[PDB]
Amino acid sequence: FLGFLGAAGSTMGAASMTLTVQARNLTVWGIKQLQARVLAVERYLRDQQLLGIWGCSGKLICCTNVPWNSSWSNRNLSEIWDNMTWLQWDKEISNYTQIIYGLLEESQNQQEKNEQDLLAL
Amino acid sequence: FLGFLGAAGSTMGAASMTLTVQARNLTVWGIKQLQARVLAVERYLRDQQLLGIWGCSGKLICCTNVPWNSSWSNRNLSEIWDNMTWLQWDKEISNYTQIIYGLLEESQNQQEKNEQDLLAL
Amino acid sequence: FLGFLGAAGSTMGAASMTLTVQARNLTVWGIKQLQARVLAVERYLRDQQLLGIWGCSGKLICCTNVPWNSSWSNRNLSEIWDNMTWLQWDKEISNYTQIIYGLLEESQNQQEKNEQDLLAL
Amino acid sequence: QVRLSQSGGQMKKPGESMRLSCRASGYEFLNCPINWIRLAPGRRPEWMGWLKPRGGAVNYARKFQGRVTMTRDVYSDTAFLELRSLTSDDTAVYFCTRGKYCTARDYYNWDFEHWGRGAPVTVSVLTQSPATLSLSPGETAIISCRTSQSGSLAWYQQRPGQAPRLVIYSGSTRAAGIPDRFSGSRWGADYNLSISNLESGDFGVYYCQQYEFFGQGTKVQV
Amino acid sequence: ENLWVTVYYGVPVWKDAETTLFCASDAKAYETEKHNVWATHACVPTDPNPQEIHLENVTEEFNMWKNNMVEQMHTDIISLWDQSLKPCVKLTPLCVTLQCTNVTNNITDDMRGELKNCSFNMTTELRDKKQKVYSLFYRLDVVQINKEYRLINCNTSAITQACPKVSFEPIPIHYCAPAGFAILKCKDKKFNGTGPCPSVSTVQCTHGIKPVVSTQLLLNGSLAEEEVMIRSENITNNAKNILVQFNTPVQINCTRPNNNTRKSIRIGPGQAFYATGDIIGDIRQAHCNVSKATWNETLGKVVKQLRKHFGNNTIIRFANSSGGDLEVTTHSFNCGGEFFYCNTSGLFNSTWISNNDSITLPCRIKQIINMWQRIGQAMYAPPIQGVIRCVSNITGLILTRDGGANNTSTETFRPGGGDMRDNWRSELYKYKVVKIEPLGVAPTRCKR
Amino acid sequence: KEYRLINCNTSAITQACPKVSFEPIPIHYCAPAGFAILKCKDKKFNGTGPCP
Amino acid sequence: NNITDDMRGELKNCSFNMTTELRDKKQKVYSLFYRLDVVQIN
Ligand SMILES: *[C@@H]1O[C@H](CO)[C@@H](O[C@@H]2O[C@H](CO)[C@@H](O[C@@H]3O[C@H](CO[C@H]4O[C@H](CO[C@H]5O[C@H](CO)[C@@H](O)[C@H](O)[C@@H]5O[C@H]5O[C@H](CO)[C@@H](O)[C@H](O)[C@@H]5O)[C@@H](O)[C@H](O[C@H]5O[C@H](CO)[C@@H](O)[C@H](O)[C@@H]5O[C@H]5O[C@H](CO)[C@@H](O)[C@H](O)[C@@H]5O)[C@@H]4O)[C@@H](O)[C@H](O[C@H]4O[C@H](CO)[C@@H](O)[C@H](O)[C@@H]4O[C@H]4O[C@H](CO)[C@@H](O)[C@H](O)[C@@H]4O[C@H]4O[C@H](CO)[C@@H](O)[C@H](O)[C@@H]4O)[C@@H]3O)[C@H](O)[C@H]2NC(C)=O)[C@H](O)[C@H]1NC(C)=O
Ligand SMILES: *[C@@H]1O[C@H](CO)[C@@H](O[C@@H]2O[C@H](CO)[C@@H](O[C@@H]3O[C@H](CO[C@H]4O[C@H](CO[C@H]5O[C@H](CO)[C@@H](O)[C@H](O)[C@@H]5O[C@H]5O[C@H](CO)[C@@H](O)[C@H](O)[C@@H]5O)[C@@H](O)[C@H](O[C@H]5O[C@H](CO)[C@@H](O)[C@H](O)[C@@H]5O[C@H]5O[C@H](CO)[C@@H](O)[C@H](O)[C@@H]5O)[C@@H]4O)[C@@H](O)[C@H](O[C@H]4O[C@H](CO)[C@@H](O)[C@H](O)[C@@H]4O[C@H]4O[C@H](CO)[C@@H](O)[C@H](O)[C@@H]4O[C@H]4O[C@H](CO)[C@@H](O)[C@H](O)[C@@H]4O)[C@@H]3O)[C@H](O)[C@H]2NC(C)=O)[C@H](O)[C@H]1NC(C)=O
Ligand SMILES: *[C@@H]1O[C@H](CO)[C@@H](O[C@@H]2O[C@H](CO)[C@@H](O[C@@H]3O[C@H](CO[C@H]4O[C@H](CO)[C@@H](O)[C@H](O)[C@@H]4O)[C@@H](O)[C@H](O[C@H]4O[C@H](CO)[C@@H](O)[C@H](O)[C@@H]4O)[C@@H]3O)[C@H](O)[C@H]2NC(C)=O)[C@H](O)[C@H]1NC(C)=O
Ligand SMILES: *[C@@H]1O[C@H](CO)[C@@H](O[C@@H]2O[C@H](CO)[C@@H](O[C@@H]3O[C@H](CO[C@H]4O[C@H](CO)[C@@H](O)[C@H](O)[C@@H]4O)[C@@H](O)[C@H](O[C@H]4O[C@H](CO)[C@@H](O)[C@H](O)[C@@H]4O)[C@@H]3O)[C@H](O)[C@H]2NC(C)=O)[C@H](O)[C@H]1NC(C)=O
Ligand SMILES: *[C@@H]1O[C@H](CO)[C@@H](O[C@@H]2O[C@H](CO)[C@@H](O[C@@H]3O[C@H](CO[C@H]4O[C@H](CO)[C@@H](O)[C@H](O)[C@@H]4O)[C@@H](O)[C@H](O[C@H]4O[C@H](CO)[C@@H](O)[C@H](O)[C@@H]4O)[C@@H]3O)[C@H](O)[C@H]2NC(C)=O)[C@H](O)[C@H]1NC(C)=O
Ligand SMILES: *[C@@H]1O[C@H](CO)[C@@H](O[C@@H]2O[C@H](CO)[C@@H](O[C@@H]3O[C@H](CO)[C@@H](O)[C@H](O[C@H]4O[C@H](CO)[C@@H](O)[C@H](O)[C@@H]4O)[C@@H]3O)[C@H](O)[C@H]2NC(C)=O)[C@H](O)[C@H]1NC(C)=O
Ligand SMILES: *[C@@H]1O[C@H](CO)[C@@H](O[C@@H]2O[C@H](CO)[C@@H](O[C@@H]3O[C@H](CO)[C@@H](O)[C@H](O[C@H]4O[C@H](CO)[C@@H](O)[C@H](O)[C@@H]4O)[C@@H]3O)[C@H](O)[C@H]2NC(C)=O)[C@H](O)[C@H]1NC(C)=O
Ligand SMILES: *[C@@H]1O[C@H](CO)[C@@H](O[C@@H]2O[C@H](CO)[C@@H](O)[C@H](O)[C@H]2NC(C)=O)[C@H](O)[C@H]1NC(C)=O
Ligand SMILES: *[C@@H]1O[C@H](CO)[C@@H](O)[C@H](O)[C@H]1NC(C)=O
Ligand SMILES: *[C@@H]1O[C@H](CO)[C@@H](O)[C@H](O)[C@H]1NC(C)=O
Ligand SMILES: *[C@@H]1O[C@H](CO)[C@@H](O)[C@H](O)[C@H]1NC(C)=O
Ligand SMILES: *[C@@H]1O[C@H](CO)[C@@H](O)[C@H](O)[C@H]1NC(C)=O
Ligand SMILES: *[C@@H]1O[C@H](CO)[C@@H](O)[C@H](O)[C@H]1NC(C)=O
C-alpha cells in the first residue's frame, strides 16, 4: 500500500493496484463543517447513483457491453495501462466523458434489464 | 427517450421503457434549500434501504418469490401492461402496498438468506 | 418477529433470525434534530461504505475468503452460535475488530477484483 | 491553577461572633461545593458544613446548627462564614476546602485536593493507629486506619506550620505531585498508608479520611 | 472443519454513547391555541401508537447519575428560556427612583408592609414628555437606598419583561433519538437507579415528561410503583442529594388571594409595560394547603424506607432548611404565571423514633427572578388578573443529610435541591442512550 | 401647531437602508431531488380541476 | 508629570458625565485615554 492517492503518478494499470484506498476515506463557524459534510455525502451519492444506474452497482470494477469508439483518442491496450497515468488519461477523455456517460446509463441497463422484462411477461 | 416522467400516461409495459430516466435526476433563505436537500437524500436512501432489504439491492428491476393474491385487484397479464398506467395502477394497489411490503422484507430475505445460514453451519 | 433488537439476548444463531428488523428503522431547538439526522445518515453510509469496499456490497450476509485466526478467541462452531449473544461476542472480539477490518478491505477486494484486471488485460 | 485565598486569623472573646472569607480562583465557581473544616491541635478534625455556589445551598453539622451561617458572592467568587456564641471549644484553625473531582457534569466533594492557607482563631468511626511514629530517614512508615462504613478513603499530610496536602484518595490512588514512595493498600475494614524511603519533607502529621469523618491523626517525626 | 469469516449486517449490538436528541409532543398540545408555550412549535408530533419492545434475556446497566440526557435537557430548557425572552419587552428605563409607601390597609405593624405603592417618572411614546405613573411591587422586588427605593436587580443585571402572550405552563415532552440510535427503558418494580437491570425494553421516544421547575418538593412530579423509592449517588455521602420518589401522590392546593388589576402603561413607541394596579378586595397572603393525614402517612412510609439504609433501629428527625438564597430555602415553583416561594417549616417539623384538616404554608411572591443562576438576564413576571388557584401532586422530595455525626448515630434531613438538574434526574433515571453498530463478523464453514 | 409621527402609538420604527432596493426581481421557485413541479399549458385553464 | 513640552501630552486625564444604574442620576467620573483616541472640537 502507498496510502491515499498513492499510485497517482503510477501507470493506470499500476494505479489499479490501489483502488480501494481512495474510496475508503471518502453559533456560526460550526456550520462551516455542516454545510460541507452535507455536500460530501451528496458528492458521494451522486457517484453511487451513477454507479448504480449503470451496469455496475457493485463498486470498484465492472464490465459493460459498450464498444470503444476510435475517435476517443485511439490508443492501444499496452499503450494505456503501461504508459499513462489516470490524471493524464482523464485529461484526454474529458471531452467525451459526458458522451460516454449517456451511452452507459441509457443504452445499457434500460435495454439490458428490459430484455428480462420481455422474458418476464 | 422522452425525458423525466416521459411515459407517465403510457401503459406500464411502455412505461417500463423509461425507468432509468426518472431515477437519474432524483443567514436565512439559504437554509431554505439546505433543509430541503437533506430531506431529498433521506427520501432517496429510504427507498434504497427498502430496495436493499428486499430481494433486490440491485436497482431498476428484480424478481421475488411472492405469489400474487387474487384479492389484490385480480387483473390479467395483458390487461395490466397493455391497458393501464402506473398512476392508474398505484391508485388501486395503494390499499395493499403496506401489506405487500411486509411480505417482501420479512418473509423473503429473512428466510431466504437464512437458508444459507443452515448451509453455512 | 420480536421487533427492533428482538433477539439481542438470544444466541447469535437465534439473533440471525432477526437481522432485517434492526436495519429497517435505522430559529433554534429545530436545529437540534437537523444536526442529529445528518450524523444519522453519516453513521449509516459509514457502515454502507465499509460494507461496499469489502466482499459484500449486498447487505445482510456475505462470505469472505479470510481464515479465522485462533488467537481471536478460539471457540468452536457450536460454542458460538448456540451458546453466546452478539453483545457478549462483540465484547471479546472488540480487541481485534480494527485488525480484521483491515484484512477484509485491503487483502480482499483489492486483490480479488485485481484478479479480473489481469484477466481483462 | 485552583487557588483558595483565605483571610487572616484573629483573636476573639467568649460570647462574640466571628467571620471568615475565602476567595476561589482558577475554576468555574458554580461547579462544585465549598467546605469548611476546623482543625484543633491533638483533636479529631471537624467538618462544619458545605455550600453550593449554585443556589447558595448549604448543609451544616448537628453541632453547629443555629450558630453557623454560610453565604457566598457569585460575582466575586467569595465564600463567607459566620459562627456565633464563641466558647473556648471553638478555638482551632479553620480551612476552606474543595474536592479534586469537580467538573460541569458532576463532582466528588470529599477528596480535598485544594486547601486554603487557614485562619488561626483563639477564643479566651475511623480508628487510626499508631498515635505517634518515630522513624529514621530511609525507613518505611506504615500508618493504619480502620473503617466501618467503607467508601472512597483519603490520606493527607500536614507539615509543621503548613496547610494539609492531599496525598492519596480512593484508598489506593496517588494525587498530583505525589511520588511512588507513597502507596496505599486495603484489606477488609483496614486501610494502610505506606511511605518508603523517608525524607525531611515527609515528616509531619497524617490524617485518614472517609467523607466528613477524620482519624485522630498520626504524627511521623524524624 | 476450518472456519471462515462472514459479515452480518443488522445485528443486535449496541454500545453506550451520547447523541443529539430531538423533541416530541402530542398533537393536542399543538391543537390547543397556547399562542406561545415554550419552543414546542418546531417540535415533531408524537407517534399516535406507542412502540415498545421488551428485550427478553437482556440485562443492561443503567446510571441515572452519569446520564447525559439530563445535561442535554437542562441546557435545552435554558436556551429555550432565552429564546422565549429575546423578542420580548426590555425594561431598561425602569430603574428610575421609586417613591414608595405602604399599601392601603389597617395594619398593627407586624404585617411588615410586604406590598409597596411606588410612584416614579417614566418615558412616554414621545422623547420630550415625562410620565408620573404609579405601580405595585413586592418587597422582595425592591430595595431602598440611603422613603426612596429602587429595583432589586439594578447592581445585578439588566432586565427583560416576559411577554403576556407566552405561558410557562409545563407541557408533556417526549425526548427521542435519531436513526442508528436507541433509548433503553428499565421496567423493574424496584430499580433503585443504578446497576444492572433484569427487565429491559427499548423505545424510540420516552413518555411525556413535564419540565416542572421546582425545588425541595417535586411539584407536579411522578409516582413510584410499589414501595416509595430512594435514590442517591452515594448514601454514605451527605454532600450528595437524596432524591425521593413517592408511590401515592400528596394533594396540595396553592392560591393567590389577592385579586389583582393589570395597568398597561406605555413606555413607547410600540413597547408597553404591564404594572400591577390597585387591589380589589382584601389584602391576604398567598398560601398552600397540604392534607395533614396524607402527609403524615407519606412521611411515615418514607421513614420506613430510610431505615433500610441507615440501620433498622435509629432515630430520624426532620428540620427546616438551614439557609441560603430565598429560592432554595423555600419551595420554589410557578402557578398561573406567578412565582411563589413557600415556607416549608410546617412539613419538615417532625421527629421519628423507633419507627383532620390541612397544613397551610406562608407563601411570598416575586416578579423579578433569576433562576438557573442566570447571569445578565433577569425576567419580570407580569401581573395576572383574577385569583390564581392551582391543584398539584407532590410526588417527591429532594433531601440533604447533615454531617459530622459519628456519635449520636441518628440522622436529620433537610430540604434542598438548589441545582435543577436533580429535577430532571427524577424522570430520566429509567432512560439511557445507546448507539447501534449493526456490523458484526462471525466465523462459519462458508467460502465462495 | 404641534405634531408627531403617526406610528407612535402603533409600533417602533426602523429606516430602510439607502443601499437596498425594493425593485422586483424575477424569481424562479424550484423543488429539490425527489420532487417535481407540474405546469398547466392549456389555452383556457380557469384555475381549478383536471388539466388536459 | 513634569514635562518640558516635547512630550506632547500623549496621555489625557478626561472628566465627563455618565449614566448610572438608575435613570435619574448623572455620574461625574474620570478616566484615562490616549491622544490617538480623542479629538478636541473648536
Ligand atoms: C440498588 O442497586 C444497586 C446496583 O444495581 C446496588 O448497589 C450495591 O450497593 C452495595 C452497597 O453499597 C454494594 O455492596 C458492596 O459491594 C462492595 C464491592 O462488591 C464487589 O466486590 C467484592 C470484593 O470487594 C473487593 O474486590 C473488588 C474487586 O474484586 C474491588 O473492586 C472492591 O473495591 C474490593 O476490593 C478490596 O478487597 C480486595 C480483596 O478482597 C483488595 O485486594 C482491594 O485492594 C480492596 O481492599 C466481591 O466479592 C463482590 O462479589 C460478591 O457478591 C456477589 C453477589 O452480590 C457474589 O455473587 C460474589 O460471588 C461475591 O461474593 C463473595 O464475597 C462475599 C463478601 O463480599 C462473601 O460473603 C461470599 O461468600 C463470596 O465469597 C462484588 O463484586 C463490597 O466490598 C461490600 O462488601 C462489604 O460491605 C458489606 C456492607 O455494605 C458487608 O456486609 C460485607 O460483608 C463486606 O464487608 C466486609 O468487607 C469490607 C471491605 O470491603 C470490610 O470493611 C468489612 O468489615 C467486611 O470485612 C470482612 O470481609 C473481608 C473480605 O472477605 C475479610 O477480609 C474481613 O476479615 C471481614 O471478615 C458491599 O457488598 C454493591 O457492590 C452494589 N452493587 C453494584 C452492582 O454496584 C444496591 O444495593 C441496590 N439497593 C437496594 C436497596 O437494593
Ligand atoms: C373551470 O374548470 C372547472 C374544473 O376544471 C369547472 O368546474 C365546474 O364547475 C361547474 C359549475 O360550478 C360544475 O358543474 C356542477 O356540477 C355539480 C356536480 O357535478 C357532478 O355531480 C353530478 C351529480 O350531482 C350529484 O351527485 C354527486 C355525486 O354523484 C354529488 O357530489 C353532487 O353534490 C350531487 O349530489 C346531489 O344529488 C344527488 C342525486 O343526484 C343526491 O344524492 C345528493 O344528496 C345531492 O343532492 C354528476 O352527474 C356530474 O357528472 C355529469 O357530468 C359529466 C360531464 O361533466 C357526465 O360525463 C356525467 O355522465 C354526468 O352527466 C349526467 O348528469 C347530468 C346532470 O348533472 C345529465 O344532464 C346527463 O345526461 C348525465 O345523466 C358531476 O360528476 C352539479 O350538481 C351541477 O349540475 C346542476 O347545475 C347546473 C347549473 O350549474 C345545471 O345545468 C344542471 O342541470 C344541474 O342542475 C340540476 O341539478 C341541481 C342539483 O345539483 C338542481 O339544483 C337543478 O335545479 C337541476 O335539477 C334537475 O336535475 C336533477 C338531477 O337529475 C333532477 O332530479 C331535477 O328534477 C331537475 O330536473 C353542475 O353541473 C362542475 O362540476 C365543475 N367541475 C369540476 C371538475 O369541479 C368550471 O366549469 C370551469 N369553468 C369554465 C368557464 O369552463
Ligand atoms: C515512479 O516512476 C518511475 C519511473 O517512471 C517508476 O519506476 C519504474 O517502475 C517500473 C515498475 O512499475 C519498472 O518496470 C519494471 O522494472 C523492473 C526492475 O528491473 C529489474 O532489472 C533491471 C535490469 O537488470 C534492474 O534495474 C534491476 O535488476 C531490476 O530488478 C522489472 O523487473 C520489471 O519487469 C518485470 O515486471 C513486469 C511487471 O511490471 C513483468 O511483466 C515482466 O515480465 C517482469 O517480470 C519491469 O520492467 C521500471 O523499470 C521503472 N523505471 C523506469 C520506468 O524508468 C516508479 O515505479 C514509479 N513509482 C511510483 C510510486 O509511481
Ligand atoms: C397516448 O395514448 C394513445 C392512445 O391511448 C396512444 O396511442 C396508441 O399507441 C399504441 C402503441 O403503444 C398503439 O398500438 C399500436 O398501434 C400500432 C399502429 O397501428 C398501425 O396500423 C394501423 C392500421 O393499419 C394504422 O393506424 C397504422 O398503419 C399503424 O402503423 C400497431 O402497429 C401496433 O401493433 C404492433 O405493435 C405491438 C406492440 O405494441 C405488437 O405486439 C404487434 O404485434 C404489432 O407488431 C400497436 O397496435 C395504438 O394503436 C394507439 N392508439 C390507440 C390505443 O387508440 C399513444 O401511444 C400514447 N402516447 C404516449 C406518449 O403515451
Ligand atoms: C431466553 O433464554 C432462555 C434460557 O437461556 C431460552 O430458553 C431456552 O430456549 C432454547 C431454544 O432457543 C431451548 O432449547 C430447545 O428446547 C426445546 C424445548 O424442549 C422440549 O423438551 C423438553 C423436555 O421434554 C421440555 O421442556 C418441553 O417438552 C420442550 O418442548 C427443544 O425442543 C429444542 O430441541 C429441538 O430444537 C433444536 C433447535 O433449537 C434442534 O436442533 C433439536 O434437534 C430439537 O429438534 C431445544 O433443546 C432451551 O431448552 C431453553 N431453556 C434453557 C436453555 O434453559 C429462551 O429461548 C430465551 N429467549 C429469548 C427470546 O432469547
Ligand atoms: C386596625 O388595626 C388596629 C391595630 O392597631 C386594630 O386595633 C387593635 O385591635 C386589637 C384587637 O383587635 C387590640 O388588641 C387588644 O389588646 C388588648 C390589651 O391591650 C387586649 O385585651 C385585647 O384582647 C381582646 O380582644 C381580642 C381580639 O380578638 C380577643 O381575642 C380577646 O379575647 C380580648 O377580647 C386585644 O388583644 C389593639 O390594642 C388595637 N390597637 C389599637 C391601636 O387600637 C383595629 O381593630 C383594626 N381595625 C380594622 C377595622 O381593621
Ligand atoms: C522638570 O522639567 C523641567 C523642564 O522645564 C526640568 O528643568 C529643565 O532641566 C533641563 C536639564 O535637565 C534644563 O536644560 C538645560 O539647559 C541649559 C541651557 O539653558 C544647559 O546648559 C543645560 O545643560 C546641562 O544639563 C544637561 C542635562 O543633563 C547636561 O547634559 C549638560 O552637560 C549640562 O550639564 C541643560 O540642558 C532646562 O533649562 C530646565 N528647564 C527649566 C524651566 O528649569 C526639570 O529638571 C525637571 N525636573 C524633574 C524632577 O523632572
Ligand atoms: C384541595 O382541593 C381539592 C379540590 O379543589 C379538594 O378536593 C375536594 O374535597 C372535598 C372534600 O372536602 C370534596 O367535597 C370535593 O368534591 C373535592 N373536589 C374535587 C375537585 O375533587 C381537596 O380536598 C383539597 N385538599 C387540600 C389539602 O386542601
Ligand atoms: C464515433 O465518433 C465519430 C466522431 O468522430 C462519430 O461520427 C461516430 O458516429 C462514432 N461512433 C458511433 C458508433 O457512434
Ligand atoms: C389473500 O387475501 C385474502 C383477503 O381477501 C386473505 O383472506 C388471504 O389470506 C390472502 N392470501 C394469503 C396467502 O394470505
Ligand atoms: C494470528 O495472531 C497471532 C498473534 O497471536 C499472530 O502472531 C499471527 O501472525 C496471526 N496470524 C496471521 C495469519 O497473521
Ligand atoms: C482486550 O484487551 C484488553 C487490554 O488491551 C484486555 O484487558 C482484555 O481482557 C481483552 N479482551 C479479552 C476478551 O481478552
Ligand atoms: C458512590 O458512588 C460511586 C458511583 O456512583 C461508586 O463508585 C462508589 O462505590 C459509591 N460509594 C459508596 C460508599 O457506595
Residue numbers in the entry:
A (entry chain B), B (entry chain K), C (entry chain C): 519 to 544, 569 to 663
D (entry chain I): 1 to 52, 52A, 53 to 82, 82A, 82B, 82C, 83 to 99, 99A, ...
E (entry chain A): 32 to 141, 150 to 185, 189 to 309, 312 to 321, 321A, 322 to 398, 411 to 503
F (entry chain J): 189 to 240
G (entry chain G): 136 to 141, 150 to 185
Text of the article:
Many antibodies capable of neutralizing a large fraction of circulating HIV isolates, broadly neutralizing antibodies (bnAbs), have been isolated from HIV-infected individuals. VRC01-class bnAbs are attractive vaccine leads owing at least to their potency, breadth and protective capacity, and to the fact that their in vitro neutralization curves typically saturate at 100% viral neutralization, in contrast to some other bnAb classes (V2/Apex, PGT151, and 10E8) that fail to reach complete neutralization for some isolates, likely influenced by glycan heterogeneity. The H-CDR2 patch makes direct contacts with four gp120 elements (loop D, β15/α3, β20/21 and β23/V5) in all VRC01-class bnAbs. Thus, while the HIV Env trimer has evolved a glycan fence around the CD4 binding site that imposes steric and entropic penalties to antibody binding, VRC01-class bnAbs appear to have evolved solutions that avoid glycan clashes and partially offset the entropic penalties.
To further delineate the full extent of the VRC01-class epitope and paratope, we determined the crystal structure (at 4.4 Å) of a partially deglycosylated BG505 SOSIP trimer in complex with PGT122 Fab and the single-chain variable fragment (scFv) of NIH45-46. The trimer backbone conformation was very similar to the same trimer crystallized either with PGT122 alone (Cα RMSD 0.97 Å for gp120) or in the unliganded state (Cα RMSD 0.74 Å for gp120), illustrating that NIH45-46 binds to the "ground-state" conformation of Env and does not induce Env conformational changes. The N276 glycan appears to be truncated in the trimer structure, as there is no density for glycan moieties beyond the first NAG, which would be consistent with trimming by EndoH that was employed for deglycosylation of the protein used for structural study. In the absence of the N276 glycan, the N234 glycan appears to have avoided trimming and makes extensive contacts to the NIH45-46 L-FW3 patch, effectively replacing the N276 glycan interactions with L-FW3 seen in the eOD+VRC01 complex. Based on our trimer structure, we estimate that NIH45-46 buries ~25% more area on the Env trimer than on core gp120, nearly half of which is due to additional protein contacts. Importantly, NIH45-46 recognizes the bridging sheet in its pre-fusion conformation on the BG505 SOSIP trimer, positioning the H-FW3 patch to interact with gp120 elements β21, β3 and the base of the V2 loop.
